[PDB]
Ligand binder design. Structure first.
Ligand SMILES: *[C@H](C)[C@H]1/C(=C/c2[nH]c(/C=C3N=C(/C=C4\NC(=O)C(CC)=C4C)C(C)=C\3CCC(=O)O)c(CCC(=O)O)c2C)NC(=O)[C@@H]1C
Ligand SMILES: *[C@H](C)[C@H]1/C(=C/c2[nH]c(/C=C3N=C(/C=C4\NC(=O)C(CC)=C4C)C(C)=C\3CCC(=O)O)c(CCC(=O)O)c2C)NC(=O)[C@@H]1C
Ligand SMILES: *[C@H](C)[C@H]1/C(=C/c2[nH]c(/C=C3N=C(/C=C4\NC(=O)C(CC)=C4C)C(C)=C\3CCC(=O)O)c(CCC(=O)O)c2C)NC(=O)[C@@H]1C
Ligand SMILES: *[C@H](C)[C@H]1/C(=C/c2[nH]c(/C=C3N=C(/C=C4\NC(=O)C(CC)=C4C)C(C)=C\3CCC(=O)O)c(CCC(=O)O)c2C)NC(=O)[C@@H]1C
Ligand SMILES: *[C@H](C)[C@H]1/C(=C/c2[nH]c(/C=C3N=C(/C=C4\NC(=O)C(CC)=C4C)C(C)=C\3CCC(=O)O)c(CCC(=O)O)c2C)NC(=O)[C@@H]1C
Ligand SMILES: *[C@H](C)[C@H]1/C(=C/c2[nH]c(/C=C3N=C(/C=C4\NC(=O)C(CC)=C4C)C(C)=C\3CCC(=O)O)c(CCC(=O)O)c2C)NC(=O)[C@@H]1C
Ligand SMILES: *[C@H](C)[C@H]1/C(=C/c2[nH]c(/C=C3N=C(/C=C4\NC(=O)C(CC)=C4C)C(C)=C\3CCC(=O)O)c(CCC(=O)O)c2C)NC(=O)[C@@H]1C
Ligand SMILES: *[C@H](C)[C@H]1/C(=C/c2[nH]c(/C=C3N=C(/C=C4\NC(=O)C(CC)=C4C)C(C)=C\3CCC(=O)O)c(CCC(=O)O)c2C)NC(=O)[C@@H]1C
Ligand SMILES: *[C@H](C)[C@H]1/C(=C/c2[nH]c(/C=C3N=C(/C=C4\NC(=O)C(CC)=C4C)C(C)=C\3CCC(=O)O)c(CCC(=O)O)c2C)NC(=O)[C@@H]1C
Lengths: 67, 161, 224, 160, 160, 161, 161, 160, 161, 160
């Protein structure tokens, strides 16, 4: 199925974390198509910044045969 | 997110000064229009779906966008665009209540342009759709509060374009 | 009482209604929160301290697995060779623990999702996505969802993915509504994409047993 | 398609196709000429199906054509005939594919959110496909109608 | 602000603001004029509050200003007067917003680790805010002082 | 992913027209060739473990690639290469059953070149391994089916080239 | 990440030979310096918060960064900076104990430059902060051990700048 | 190496090296010459250890070298002793490092998938290293043999 | 869980007393047996699969349990019993190292009877398999340490029966 | 206990204890006589340490003992000396275990919430243990003091 390769930077606001957090701060991850709307909202509500969005798998304007 | 109160606090916090006379009047102006911002959101919340209902019919429907070949032909794409415009109208109302457009830069415009470009979503059509929302939002609410909403809806348009 | 599983490492074991009748009905209403014992510090309970939800149990509860160390082949510093890359056993132990959380026991040879493992190891997907994929697996459907009562299967899934029994009706009815309309896969999706999951476990954190039922802790710590 | 549905199910378990899965594709590909015959009949008399089933909907539920309804006027009636023409097109894509995925991806997923924003009763659209099934079954042979109605009944089931 | 909290709670549930929540906003809006009056009195006498409570801290805790202490010298006392000016400024931001969030965000998160790096005792800065509370409650009316004390006690509570 | 039927449907859906005779000819072509597609797939799936084993032996084994200094020396790297060619055979079967090579682009060839360049995986050694797979499969299924299988195995070679 | 022992193992594993006399002396050289590495690590560990204390006072404190408008003004952003310099000190100790700067690449400078540009953390100021760490450490552990620490702290600086 | 493992363990808890962990490296550093001596003896007699334990394997398990087996043939017997030469090389890296990671990394992780592909019995490779332990214990002192056994048994346990 | 050290500490802590002569002697006895426990655990670790192999062979294999109708018939249920005895041996090793059976009650025996009854697992057949482990472990490890392992394996048996 | 830590880590990974973990216990077992020596020294002169560190605390911090303080009175000072006697007992459990678990489990977790409820300054209790560290250090050997200090600083560090 079609997926997004997205880069996001989420900083900590609530607590100072003594452990290594660089992997969960600035990351580039692949997300499913149906999950991206929930994922983008999660980054936005936490107070993060989306760097780059690209459609890694699939092609724009797929009517049938996207799964 | 940053509100109008929070923005005045933050602006004075940058210089490191106390809330001066210029900062005090900016707060008082927001507190004066506070009742106006509450009633406007109450009208929006009453008929939130109704704005999205007619805005597609005014601009997008019976056009090449909804026609086979367009990016709003399928039910899935239609339900996506309906959702988008519903979220666009919701976050504009949030910006109207807060009195700041910093929420818009954080909660919508933060990585939507490159999302739309990657999916082949036409930028011209979506701007026209939010423009179709703008005047009908002003019609349902009023002239003073509709102009307030008209700024934030245009702020989404300027960010996407 | 039948909807409560035994608080054990693996295996969804439920009291049968037919076999040895021990059904104990109680009129529970909607807004009825169940008192749960935290595995870690008693102060770190989210009922009284909601800010301390993502606080790790320090030798009181379960061991926390995190992708803190750098995954092998992340940067092009170790060019071509470097056969003895030390950060490799840590991520493999994380995978095994991630398998152990979704499925209580370690799986067999032809059961491990090799595609999902290597995507995590390459750094294509986070732990949150990896846990989701293991719970969205057809094996998890076959082993825990299909042979069990719908709400028993929901309860056990919540005790595996969040490491917590459901507080009451409000949460149980939510996932049961998703189970009716959307299906099993969306129930998995809802439990992972929940705010409480995100607060307790990050993108790199493997889930763990956070809260026990009083009856479950009694089975553990009232023996000889 | 039933080929794609088989592949994605096999890829999810990370395995080759089952003996049953390979047999089903074999049964589909042999009966592909029969599935093409169903399509050719439905594409040929496409305008007669939607017109009859449309009129049969309007006599059953006249509140649609009556004022206050969604499809009021000759323009909106033509839109309703087009909607049924679009759905008959989805069935023809469904029968050749051997799966309901093409019907889902275009005109089933997020349909309840669509017709809500249009203000169209979805149970009336469900009843329009019911009538479309009845006219199509009377048009072509019963052995082919039973296969055609199976995909029609899914469209009804997902709509209602 | 409570406007910030309301939107956060609304967006989390993916819904518009409830009439109960909207009633809270408009009531805060009406009470915002009274909240601005409290801030004006605090910023009006920002010099006299800091200097009095600063001196009262030096009388209660002489080891602070004594040689060997952290705040010994003309430079080190100036930084302590700066710190108390900063925390009073945080209170003025707190009373305007009608919330403890802008205090928490700017100058009340990881303060325990902040003064530990400098070597400043956290108990002494907790006392300094408590002294600032007493001067603010004395100079300014008691009804508004009880409102202001809620923000002061929040600082002391986080400090200790 | 897209197969042969879905590609015909999608090409008919963009224009919005029904299945025309010109588009029907490509369907008839798939329904005729599908007899060869299923038969060969059942043979490949049967000997899946032995096809890889034979191909690795003649191409990769007892060479400088598997020798210390190569990229296929380490047991971890060996098992990875076995895993890769197990995927390469499996996804080529999927493409052969589908009648389209879009699946290979959708799952396999997505971020494969950049990963292989970063890890320092030899391009020439991988191609020769898939070419070894091609010859083993063609000798097992037949001349016509092996050529048809060999198209997708050359497509995955050219994509990694 | 590899250490000086692991680097000797890796180099011998590349050729596929047993540990040669050249690699044998490399191990004994590390075991000769092993007493110095453990001793210095114990001093840094004991005065971990103490080193950072002198470092910030020398470079960062009483500047525009700590002053309003700066990036180290906020108490959260100050506590993050102490924490950052707590990382830079601990990982330099890790690199010193190992005898290789492989840990500083895979863990520290994996995506540090990317996140610092994203947040807007000034590179010039933080490099000076690590340079302030360098002088404090070398004064504490000694000239011999401070030379080794000075290399790795420069390696953090060079990777970031 | 043990120094690297101590770093990894400390970084996992996000803390500095423990006084007990620092003494553990110190004990390794001081007794470095004695542990490196073990590698010298295994390197010097790298031939006669493989030849003897190889011959011991073919008497202990004659089925693998018998026709139909994996190690049957002149070439297949050769690569088996070549494999035993590799496994001894892993041990020499292991006894130098002071950790079981270098043995695990090169030739122990994903070893089950390798030998299954080649059609090699994993239990027979477990017996080959078992005999390599027995020759190593004979050609070395009791203290050195007990030290080496801890690394040999790790290869045994992971194999079977 | 608690080991022999923690058990002495907890008992002294409950009383609210410092570690007396009786408490110190209990620790000294554990440190005397500490060398015996570690060496025993390493033997079990090396021959983990071997113990389970010869446990099933003695008691379970070539019986009505293995044959159709029995519980350990299917490969699924066979690998389940292998895993069970692998878990039983490992947790006996943990208790052997700790010098207390607190881990067995906390992690194994907590509702193990209710589990085995519900599934339909024979208790007598399982006990015999753990009894088979005991005899195999004692023959492998030794007399004193084999007795020590035998105590905790009896503790599993007593909690199951 | 480090034995407990090693088993818990092995339990979580669901594997037998690592040869590195087994050697870690083996080193602790052999070096257990040294740990019991420090414990007996602290137990033997428990009344001497508490009395010395008590007086040293009350001179440095007079405010806690002075009228209006938390530990003002003959009964309140006796509780404060009892508090340190508890903390010194917690240290002796830590030295014996060779781990900072028993000190954390019994008398470190929920100390901040405890002393806030009682109205006890937390930094003064941090000073009290710091005085207990100083007396204990100058009553045993340098190697004994350095090992004991690791547990003492853990009590100070968590409370501060
Ligand atoms: C409607 C005005 C036009 C239109 C919409 C459209 N958008 C998508 C795709 C997505 N929309 C978003 C955008 C958002 N990200 C956010 O965080 C928010 C605010 C909460 C929004 C609104 C996302 C995430 C997607 C990705 C897919 C998804 O649905 O989650 C589509 C689908 C693209 C496709 O071709 O499949 C569409 C149709 N496009 C038009 O043509 C209208 C004029
Ligand atoms: C082998 C000695 C005998 C045997 C075993 C057997 N076990 C199962 C399945 C399960 N085993 C357990 C028990 C445990 N859960 C725990 O927490 C622990 C302690 C760590 C144990 C040992 C559970 C929960 C199950 C259920 C399924 C699962 O694996 O999660 C089976 C299969 C039963 C079935 O029908 O599924 C068997 C056969 N039975 C025999 O015949 C041997 C004498
Ligand atoms: C104090 C009055 C007495 C006392 C208390 C005590 N409680 C615990 C542990 C727990 N307390 C609860 C109970 C609640 N959590 C809830 O959600 C509610 C309803 C609002 C209550 C009242 C729970 C769940 C626990 C377990 C730990 C946790 O927080 O999750 C302890 C500790 C027990 C232990 O050994 O861990 C104690 C001591 N006991 C006394 O001595 C007082 C008389
Ligand atoms: C007839 C069965 C019922 C009816 C018809 C009706 N529909 C609309 C609105 C639209 N429906 C469509 C069509 C589709 N979009 C899709 O994604 C698919 C699947 C391929 C279909 C079938 C569209 C695009 C529209 C919008 C209009 C446009 O073409 O731009 C209307 C118009 C409603 C209005 O007033 O705007 C009507 C009348 N109405 C009934 O009551 C019948 C039961
Ligand atoms: C007076 C109440 C106490 C005191 C003062 C003191 N402070 C410092 C150092 C600093 N103080 C701060 C604090 C802040 N500045 C901010 O921007 C914020 C956020 C709003 C806060 C809370 C900081 C960051 C510094 C660093 C100096 C700088 O601004 O560059 C000192 C000097 C410490 C030293 O020895 O270097 C002193 C003396 N000390 C006391 O004893 C009083 C209780
Ligand atoms: C064998 C033909 C040659 C070879 C292969 C090799 N591959 C890897 C590692 C990876 N390969 C992939 C690629 C894929 N991901 C997928 O999901 C699929 C199927 C759609 C493929 C083909 C990825 C992402 C990995 C995993 C990354 C990891 O190793 O953690 C390696 C190991 C790389 C290393 O050095 O660590 C190797 C060796 N290289 C050869 O030598 C052969 C010629
Ligand atoms: C101090 C030298 C300078 C400074 C600090 C500063 N840092 C941040 C934010 C982050 N810092 C890091 C870095 C790391 N986290 C890790 O995990 C590691 C590896 C072990 C390091 C080195 C990251 C990733 C962040 C993000 C936040 C987080 O918690 O991870 C800030 C911004 C704080 C904010 O959120 O606003 C600041 C200010 N800036 C200066 O002014 C100094 C020169
Ligand atoms: C002897 C103990 C057993 C045995 C040996 C055997 N091995 C192969 C094939 C290969 N051996 C390896 C494995 C390794 N290379 C490494 O890098 C390491 C780790 C350091 C090892 C151990 C490899 C890569 C091969 C492939 C061929 C090659 O060397 O290029 C064979 C041949 C298999 C075949 O039939 O083709 C054999 C016989 N077999 C037994 O029966 C013994 C138990
Ligand atoms: C012959 C093809 C190969 C072979 C066979 C072999 N098997 C065993 C031992 C057992 N086999 C099984 C397996 C099953 N029992 C079942 O119920 C099922 C599922 C339907 C299977 C597949 C079991 C459980 C046993 C134990 C005996 C028993 O049933 O009681 C042996 C004996 C080995 C031993 O003594 O341990 C043998 C020889 N071995 C080969 O090498 C042939 C290629």
């Amino acid at each position: 199925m079609r997926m997004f390769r997205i880069t996001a930077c989420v900083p900590s606001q609530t607590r100072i974390r003594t452990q290594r957090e660089l992997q969960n701060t600035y990351f580039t991850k692949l997300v499913p198509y149906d999950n991206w709307f929930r994922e983008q909202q999660r980054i936005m509500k936490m107070g993060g910044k989306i760097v780059k969005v690209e459609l890694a798998t699939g092609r724009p304007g797929t009517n049938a045969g996207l799964a | 997110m940053q509100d109008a109160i929070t923005a005045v606090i933050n602006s004075a916090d940058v210089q490191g000064k106390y809330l001066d006379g210029a900062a005090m009047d900016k707060l008082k102006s927001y507190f004066a229009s506070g009742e106006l911002r509450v009633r406007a959101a109450s009208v929006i919340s009453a008929n939130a779906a109704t704005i999205v209902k007619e805005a597609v019919a005014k601009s997008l429907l019976y056009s090449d966008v909804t026609r086979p070949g367009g990016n709003m032909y399928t039910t899935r794409r239609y339900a996506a665009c309906i959702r988008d415009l519903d979220y666009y109208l919701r976050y504009a109302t949030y910006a109207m209540l807060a009195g700041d457009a910093s929420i818009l830069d954080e909660r919508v415009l933060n990585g939507l342009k490159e999302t739309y470009n990657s999916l082949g979503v036409p930028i011209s059509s979506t701007v026209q759709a939010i423009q179709a929302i703008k005047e009908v939002t002003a019609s349902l609410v009023g002239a003073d509060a509709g102009k307030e909403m008209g700024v934030y809806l245009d702020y989404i348009c300027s960010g996407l374009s | 009482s039948g909807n409560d599983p035994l608080e054990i490492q693996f295996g969804a074991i439920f009291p049968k209604e037919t076999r040895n009748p021990s059904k104990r009905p109680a009129p529970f209403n909607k807004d009825t929160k169940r008192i749960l014992i935290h595995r870690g510090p008693a102060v770190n309970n989210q009922v009284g301290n909601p800010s301390a939800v993502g606080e790790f149990p320090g030798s009181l509860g379960a061991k926390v697995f995190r992708l803190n160390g750098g995954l092998p082949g992340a940067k092009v510093g170790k060019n071509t060779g470097t056969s003895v890359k030390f950060g490799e056993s840590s991520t493999q132990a994380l995978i095994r623990a991630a398998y152990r959380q979704v499925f209580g026991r370690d799986l067999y040879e032809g059961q491990r999702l090799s595609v999902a493992e290597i995507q995590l190891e390459n750094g294509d997907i986070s732990v949150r996505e990896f846990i989701k994929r293991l719970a969205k697996s057809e094996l998890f459907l076959k082993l825990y969802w299909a042979p069990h009562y719908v709400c028993k299967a929901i309860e056990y899934m919540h005790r595996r993915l969040l490491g917590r029994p459901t507080y009451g009706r409000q949460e149980m009815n939510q996932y049961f509504d998703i189970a009716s309309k959307q299906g099993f896969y969306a129930v998995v999706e809802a439990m992972i994409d929940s705010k409480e999951y995100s607060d307790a476990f990050g993108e790199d954190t493997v889930p763990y047993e956070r809260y026990l039922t009083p009856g479950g802790l009694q089975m553990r710590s009232a023996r000889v | 398609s039933i080929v794609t549905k088989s592949i994605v199910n096999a890829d999810a378990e990370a395995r080759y196709l089952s003996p049953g899965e390979l047999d089903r594709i074999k049964a589909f590909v042999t009966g592909g000429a029969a599935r093409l015959r169903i399509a050719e009949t439905l594409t040929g008399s496409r305008e007669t199906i939607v017109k009859q089933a449309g009129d049969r909907l309007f006599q059953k539920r006249p509140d649609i054509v009556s004022p206050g309804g969604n499809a009021y006027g000759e323009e909106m009636t033509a839109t309703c005939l087009r909607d049924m023409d679009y759905y008959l097109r989805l069935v023809t894509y469904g029968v050749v594919s051997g799966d309901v995925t093409p019907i889902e991806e275009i005109g089933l997923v997020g349909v309840r959110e669509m017709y809500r924003s249009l203000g169209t009763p979805i149970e009336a659209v469900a009843q329009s496909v019911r009538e479309m099934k009845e006219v199509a079954s009377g048009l072509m042979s019963s052995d082919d109608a039973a296969e055609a109605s199976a995909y029609f009944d899914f469209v009804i089931g997902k709509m209602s």
